[PDB]
């Protein structure tokens, strides 16, 4: 039984991607200081405890599920699509999410506000004519006052309905103050939608929509994610744990319940 570790995660044979200052979700959405991870791949994503967010304050209803799905997909390969947002201003940004000197936003998201004095009922559609699954990431803005709601989206109450033939999600935005995060009581909530082959994404909204810019290519492989602070090293080791890479020669182990690769069983 293996009860000791080297203290270091070996960079072979598996492709290890060090997240450094970024969680996988921040990389997915396109937090400016995670832009280097655009279009990256991994057999194992390593989330460090030093990770932080530095964009618009946000949460994810059902965080752990989305995180797991993306981690298992093992890629952030984005494909921009031509979404036609008729009658609304695009590319909304913030000082809470700087990219370079100027104000910016999540790179994979498109913050739609009013155009002139009107916010029309948006209704776009986007079929999946490919043979693989598309992952769309979108959200809803929750203003902290009514003043903000009517300044940004005109209508006193917003609504976001993203749907496919199988499933549907309608969100009504909650107008009210949250705890102050980097000078902002307002929030964005993130939702996701999978669109299978032959199926059609339909987004419809009269306010508060944080629109998607395209999709992410989904795969099913050996990819996964792990929380660890152990540094990376130029060695070979089949088994990886959070406490470090371990020899798998012995039939069992009790270094950690969480493992990746061809490993001994936990006791």
């Amino acid at each position, epitope marked *: 039984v293996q009860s000791s570790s080297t203290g270091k995660i070996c960079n072979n044979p598996h492709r290890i991607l060090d997240g450094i200052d970024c969680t996988l979700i921040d990389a997915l959405l396109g937090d400016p200081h995670c832009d280097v991870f655009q279009n990256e791949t991994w057999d194992l994503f390593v989330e460090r405890s030093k990770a932080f967010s530095n964009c*618009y304050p946000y949460d994810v209803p059902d965080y752990a599920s989305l995180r797991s799905l993306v981690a298992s997909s093992g890629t952030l390969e984005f494909i921009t699509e031509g979404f036609t947002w008729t009658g609304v*201003t695009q*590319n*909304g*940004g*913030s*000082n*809470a999410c700087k990219r370079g000197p*100027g*104000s*910016g936003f999540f790179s994979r998201l498109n*913050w739609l*506000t*009013k155009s*002139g*004095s009107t916010y029309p009922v948006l209704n776009v559609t986007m079929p999946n004519n490919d043979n693989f699954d598309k992952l769309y990431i979108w959200g809803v803005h929750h*203003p*902290s*006052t009514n*003043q*903000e709601q*009517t*300044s*940004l989206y005109v209508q006193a109450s917003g609504r976001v309905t993203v749907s496919t033939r199988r499933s549907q999600q309608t969100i009504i935005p909650n107008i009210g103050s949250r705890p102050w995060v980097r*000078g*902002l*009581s*307002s929030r964005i909530s993130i939702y996701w939608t999978i669109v299978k082959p032959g199926d059609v994404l339909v987004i419809n909204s009269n306010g508060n929509l944080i629109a998607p810019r395209g999709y992410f290519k989904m795969r099913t492989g050996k990819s996964s994610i792990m929380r660890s602070d152990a540094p990376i090293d130029t060695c070979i080791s089949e088994c990886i744990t959070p406490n470090g890479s371990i020899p798998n020669d012995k039939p069992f182990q009790n270094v950690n319940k969480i493992t990746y690769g061809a490993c001994p069983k936990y006791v």
Partner: antibody
Amino acid sequence: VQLQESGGGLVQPGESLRLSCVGSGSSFGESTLSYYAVSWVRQAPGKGLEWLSIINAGGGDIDYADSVEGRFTISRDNSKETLYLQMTNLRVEDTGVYYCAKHMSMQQVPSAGWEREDLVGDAFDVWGQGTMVTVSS
Amino acid sequence: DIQLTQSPSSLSASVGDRVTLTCQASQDIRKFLNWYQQKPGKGPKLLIYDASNLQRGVPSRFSGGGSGTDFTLIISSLQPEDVGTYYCQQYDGLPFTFGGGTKVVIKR
């Protein structure tokens, strides 16, 4: 929104003079002047309108005309709903009435933390009454 | 820098006449163009924004048209109050400029 200017007066050629412009009230929603981009515009006696300087809602994306570049500095204090035009090294031909003029398209919502990435700088939908600046000896 | 040339420089028409002011442009400015009514001893007020759009509050008798380089501001029925100078203004590119002016006078 309504606007009003102040700070105008008599000055000697070469002197400095600050002009202020206070915004008051509410437009669509309850949006104050701090939601908008504003520019300074002057009119010499018996002449046309000359655009001077623009500033985006949040204080960035500033540009000038060649006639006043290097000498004039545009700036704003949104906590006070006020715009400023500092003028230095003034000359006789800078004489005229100075207007504050708001661009209509909303550029920010401060309480929300939104900013439009493109500076539209479109139609001057609100003007002040104007303030008289005179440069002489 | 984009120059705007208005025509005429000065005009006279009777109460209820159809009046045509024009603004011509140094280059293609698409429809990034506005019009303004400066009354005498008072500040400018927006009439037309973005080539053709009438401002809320401004009488229906005023209208706007054009694109590219040529643009028109029509008064369908000139009134006593409609005296004063009219300016066209562009914002296609910096620096922003105004027209020379068109002074309108009532003929009685």
